Ligand binder design. Structure first.
Ligand SMILES: CC(C)CN(C[C@@H](O)[C@H](Cc1ccccc1)NC(=O)O[C@H]1[C@H]2CO[C@H]3OC[C@@H]1[C@H]3C2)S(=O)(=O)c1ccc(B(O)O)cc1
Ligand SMILES: [Cl-]
Ligand SMILES: [Cl-]
Ligand SMILES: [Cl-]
Ligand SMILES: [Cl-]
Ligand code: NA
Lengths: 99, 99
């Protein structure tokens, strides 16, 4: 698809068999999701955004579908205000910015 | 241009007679620039992201040049860690996400 930006670029994702809404976010290096259960071990990460830092749980090699496109990669889980798909997974779905 | 997302999508902007580097950010509703002076009236605003809220000054009807393309809109000025070009200005340069 070609997504214009008059509205937020919200898509449906599927992670852990569950559908969620997330924002396609070219300003995010990494994908950050709200609290949920994922399998396996996690590693710590402190990430900084507009208002300061939050602690998140880093899960690697997680199966996630984004707007129907299959990805497998890193997901950060923590107290984000919105689910954000960052460049680590936007590159997996072949996303570019165009003007 | 087509901008891939292997790296942060940084561009040069001209705002208030100044050159700055800014991120093309589909996850931002509005454009948020680090502290600088702009002319005309403003009003206070609180904006929230990862890590909470910051206080900014909202300036309306500001001309920006974004990677050589002129646009006009609202610019929020305050203690952002990164200069962000949000959707309010990305739409005006005809920016789309494509996959
Ligand atoms: C969160 C979004 C719903 C909204 N945001 C826009 C978003 O793209 C931000 C931009 C940014 C980049 C770096 C530092 C600070 C901000 N991305 C962000 O926080 O990314 C973080 C995390 C992802 O992986 C790494 O990449 C960078 C770091 C780091 C950890 S926003 O900036 O919070 C924002 C909120 C509100 C309004 B508004 O109301 O117009 C406008 C903007
Ligand atoms: Cl990844
Ligand atoms: Cl980079
Ligand atoms: Cl605007
Ligand atoms: Cl359009
Ligand atoms: Na003004």
């Amino acid at each position: 698809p070609q997504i214009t930006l008059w509205k937020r670029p919200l898509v449906t994702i599927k992670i852990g068999g569950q559908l969620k809404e997330a924002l396609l976010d070219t300003g995010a290096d990494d994908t950050v999701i709200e609290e949920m259960s994922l399998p396996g071990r996690w590693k710590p990460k402190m990430i900084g955004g507009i208002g300061g830092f939050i602690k998140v749980r880093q899960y690697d090699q997680i199966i996630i579908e984004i707007a129907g496109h299959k990805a497998i990669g890193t997901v950060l889980v923590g107290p984000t205000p919105v689910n954000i798909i960052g460049r680590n997974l936007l590159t997996q779905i072949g996303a570019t910015l165009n003007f």
